[PDB]
Paper text:
The structure and binding properties of three of these nanobodies (A8, H6 and B5-5) have been characterized in detail providing insight into their binding epitopes on the Omicron spike protein. Binding of the SARS-CoV-2 spike protein to the human ACE-2 receptor at the cell surface is the first step in viral entry and blocking this interaction correlates with neutralization of infection.
The monomeric nanobodies were each mixed with a hexaPro stabilized version of the BA.1 spike protein trimer in a 3.6:1 molar ratio and then vitrified on cryo-EM grids. The incorporation of six prolines in the S2 domain has been shown to considerably increase the stability of this version of the prefusion trimer. By contrast, H6 formed a complex with the BA.1 spike trimer and an approximately equal mixture of the two forms was observed on the grids. In one, an H6 nanobody was bound to each RBD of the spike trimer in the so-called ‘all up’ conformation, and in the second the RBDs were in a ‘2 up 1 down’ state with two nanobodies bound to the ‘up’ conformation but missing from the ‘down’ conformation. H6 is only able to bind the spike trimer in the ‘up’ conformation, with the epitope partly inaccessible when the RBD is ‘down’.
Author numbering:
A (entry chain B): 918 to 1144
B (entry chain B): 628 to 673, 686 to 724
C (entry chain C): 725 to 838, 845 to 1062
D (entry chain C): 1111 to 1144
């Protein structure tokens, strides 16, 4: 119930964050702005004179003889061709960036939405659980849901515990104590439990490990099933 | 010629990037703003005036690292983040 | 590699210095300065952004405890020391000494300029200083190292939680399929091996055959491009003379116009070629920056199971070290 | 020592190629026979 409530609240805040004025879609807008300014520069480049008498081919042809009108239009042609090759170069340069971005987006799509990814800070920040994509104009939006712990507390810990001259090691947990008694709990959440034979495993004696604490280990078999 | 910015708009600030005129350097390390080279971010603050300072990378911290001492989380939070590509 | 040297060019004086007539002649050509200025500014912005992405990754500045005993393991050769004005590790100092052969110049105040940077500067070829300084970069690295040592991977996923160092290595070996009792029995010898490897790292770096050719390559390429751009000025380009005053006083107007036009076209071609090379270099500069950011995120902030990603073998730890226009990782 | 806790039983001894006859020690019955 609490997890669902938190998820619903988090989903709700996304709408307000997006609908608020400081739009975070700078990436998509940058491409459009770059393309628009490139086309504007290219269309305005036709006004450049390139050392000629006039930028009007009709006026040059009408008010000038072929003997050097040929070279005037020739030079204008060279300048315009230079402009086109420059624009093509800029576009094909940006094409590689677009390809890299698309490849990264597809990789993230596959590795975050089609499954749970263990990679650190790949599908969002934290412990990725699942992801949700949303279509965007010339882009895509991912929604990564992660696990963030809170409210940590401090407990005395030991590497192992010796019981009868032999060291006992936690199976998939840690040894903790906020004082008198000792308990075994999972790493990512506080769930103290009694240290029993099935909770730990024995590995050798208890005079070779540094920091071991001599404590008892409970047998869940003999005291009750003594019949 | 006519571009002089008065006679002394503010205390001229000598920086690694050059000479800064029209802002006052403060000794308060705030979060960054419109940036200047060599780690100077200039900000508009309080009446109101443009000020220059030095970048504050982040809040200082120190983990109480110790023998046999461990921190175990008891609460958890569900976080959703938006990413655009 | 991370970033490459931000530079700016003054087109109007590069095309012709101390020539008012040329200023009017180029004005009739329209605008071949707005776009190259925009491209250079974008390149510099991307350069700063690359460093910010790579290094600015933690919101907290962590400090090591005054006690420097961590399971007997050595960290002196990588921890910064207050015994220097720059709080740099001795490995960082060795790297700075190794790479300081070629640099921006460390001075941009023009006071010492009356002999290589000045020659380019007098042709209107400036260098803009980076936003972040080496002190801030070293502070980032030190905070990252302190948080790593004191917390493990918890600081990389939210609040930093203290954890004993041998315990953390124990869980890490448990993360590669090795039981913790192995470490709890072989801790002394493991620490001895680690310290021996760390010490051997120092002599490997301080030895003559420097392997830091990658960073030097970028600086050499930038320098060579700058020199060839400078030398292209002396070219005749089919003109009569390469001197503006000579070609002006020695020639009549109706021919001097096309004379200047030819040189203008040639130098414009040189400039466009240079800026195109700058963009195509910034391409892999950004690519390498992205790769380095991904590597530091996946190896420093956590333990990676990817084969041959964080070093060779079974990765345990990766320690980052600041480098001039680069970063150095020590894979355990 | 290959005990009951070190292994899990599944199937019989006529479907696996290379299975070897060997004893498995029970850590329950012999000493805790009270
Ligand atoms: C964790 O254990 C430590 C005991 O060392 C306590 O941490 C304190 O942390 C603050 C700031 O982080 C320091 O100024 C104190 O000096 C630390 N206490 C001591 C005794 O040194 C803390 O009380 C414990 N619990 C949590 C949740 O951190
Ligand atoms: C450490 O925390 C545990 C967990 O609460 C404490 O265990 C409690 O012990 C009292 C003692 O009679 C019992 O009444 C409670 O039922 C126990 N709680 C649980 C959840 O089992 C323990 O007292 C704490 N202090 C130590 C171990 O010194
Ligand atoms: C973790 O902390 C949050 C803090 O908000 C707890 O959220 C509270 O949950 C209860 C029960 O659902 C509500 O009555 C409160 O109103 C919530 N807090 C707030 C500020 O609204 C959450 O229960 C905690 N969970 C655990 C497992 O400790
Ligand atoms: C880590 O190893 C270095 C080795 O350099 C220690 O620094 C000292 O270095 C000098 C010169 O190499 C040696 O003569 C000293 O013996 C070294 N000191 C010690 C204590 O070994 C550095 O101290 C070591 N780190 C720690 C925490 O001991
Ligand atoms: C084991 O128990 C003995 C009791 O005689 C004690 O002296 C010793 O410290 C214990 N070992 C530990 C706590 O590691
Ligand atoms: C263990 O405790 C000693 C004494 O307080 C301290 O000097 C040392 O650094 C500690 N070792 C750890 C926390 O790994
Ligand atoms: C074990 O010995 C029995 C004896 O009859 C035989 O039937 C069986 O095939 C043997 N199994 C293996 C794995 O050797």
């Amino acid at each position: 119930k609490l997890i669902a409530n938190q998820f619903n609240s988090a989903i709700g805040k996304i709408q307000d964050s997006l609908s608020s004025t400081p739009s975070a879609l700078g990436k998509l807008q940058d491409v459009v702005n770059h393309n628009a300014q490139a086309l504007n520069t290219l269309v305005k480049q036709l006004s450049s004179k390139f050392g000629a008498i006039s930028s009007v081919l009709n006026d040059i042809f009408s008010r000038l003889d072929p003997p050097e009108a040929e070279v005037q239009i020739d030079r204008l042609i060279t300048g315009r061709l230079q402009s086109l090759q420059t624009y093509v170069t800029q576009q094909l340069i940006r094409a590689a960036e677009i390809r890299a971005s698309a490849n990264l987006a597809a990789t993230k799509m596959s590795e975050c939405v089609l499954g749970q990814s263990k990679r650190v800070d790949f599908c969002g920040k934290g412990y990725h659980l699942m992801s949700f994509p949303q279509s965007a104009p010339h882009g895509v939006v991912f929604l990564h849901v992660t696990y963030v712990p809170a409210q940590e507390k401090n407990f005395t810990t030991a590497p192992a515990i010796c019981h009868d001259g032999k060291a006992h090691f936690p199976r998939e947990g840690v040894f903790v104590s906020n004082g008198t008694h000792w308990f075994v709990t999972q790493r990512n959440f506080y769930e103290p439990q009694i240290i029993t034979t099935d909770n730990t495993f024995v590995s050798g004696n208890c005079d070779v490990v540094i920091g071991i604490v001599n404590n008892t280990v409970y047998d869940p078999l003999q005291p009750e099933l003594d019949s | 010629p006519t571009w002089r910015v008065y006679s002394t708009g503010s205390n001229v600030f000598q920086t690694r990037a050059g000479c800064l005129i029209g802002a006052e350097y403060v000794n308060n390390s705030y979060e960054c703003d419109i940036p200047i080279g060599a780690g100077i971010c200039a900000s508009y603050q309080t009446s109101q005036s443009i000020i220059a300072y030095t970048m504050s990378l982040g809040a200082e911290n120190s983990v109480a690292y110790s023998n046999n001492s461990i921190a175990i989380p008891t609460n958890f939070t569900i976080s959703v983040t938006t990413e655009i590509l | 590699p991370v970033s490459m040297t931000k530079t700016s060019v003054d087109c109007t004086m590069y095309i012709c210095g101390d020539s008012t007539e040329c200023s009017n002649l180029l004005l009739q050509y329209g605008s071949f300065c707005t776009q190259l200025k925009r491209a250079l500014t974008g390149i510099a912005v991307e350069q700063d952004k690359n460093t910010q992405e790579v290094f600015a990754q933690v919101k907290q500045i962590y400090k090591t405890p005054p006690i420097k005993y961590f399971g007997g393991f050595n960290f002196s050769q990588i921890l910064p020391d207050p015994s220097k004005p720059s709080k740099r590790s001795p490995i960082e100092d060795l790297l700075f000494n190794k790479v300081t052969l070629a640099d921006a110049g460390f001075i941009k105040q023009y006071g010492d300029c009356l002999d290589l940077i000045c020659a380019q500067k007098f042709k209107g070829l400036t260098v803009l200083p980076p936003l972040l300084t080496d002190e801030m970069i070293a502070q980032y690295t030190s905070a990252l190292l302190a948080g790593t040592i004191t917390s493990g991977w918890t600081f990389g996923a939210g609040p930093a939680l203290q954890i004993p160092f041998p315990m953390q290595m124990a869980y890490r070996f448990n993360g590669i399929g090795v039981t913790q009792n192995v470490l709890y029995e072989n801790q002394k010898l493991i620490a001895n091996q680690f310290n021996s490897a760390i010490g051997k790292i120092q002599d490997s770096l301080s030895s003559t055959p420097s392997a830091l050719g990658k960073l030097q390559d970028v600086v050499n390429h930038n320098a060579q491009a700058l020199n060839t751009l400078v030398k292209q000025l002396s070219s005749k380009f089919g003109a009569i003379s390469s001197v503006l005053n000579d070609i002006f006083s020695r020639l009549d107007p109706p021919e001097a116009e096309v004379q200047i036009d030819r040189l203008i076209t040639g130098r414009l071609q040189s400039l466009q070629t240079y800026v195109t090379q700058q963009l195509i270099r910034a391409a892999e500069i950004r690519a390498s920056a992205n790769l380095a950011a991904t590597k530091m995120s996946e190896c420093v902030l956590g333990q990676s199971k990817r084969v041959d990603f964080c070093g060779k073998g079974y990765h345990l730890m990766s320690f980052p070290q600041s480098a001039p226009h680069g970063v150095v990782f020590l894979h355990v």
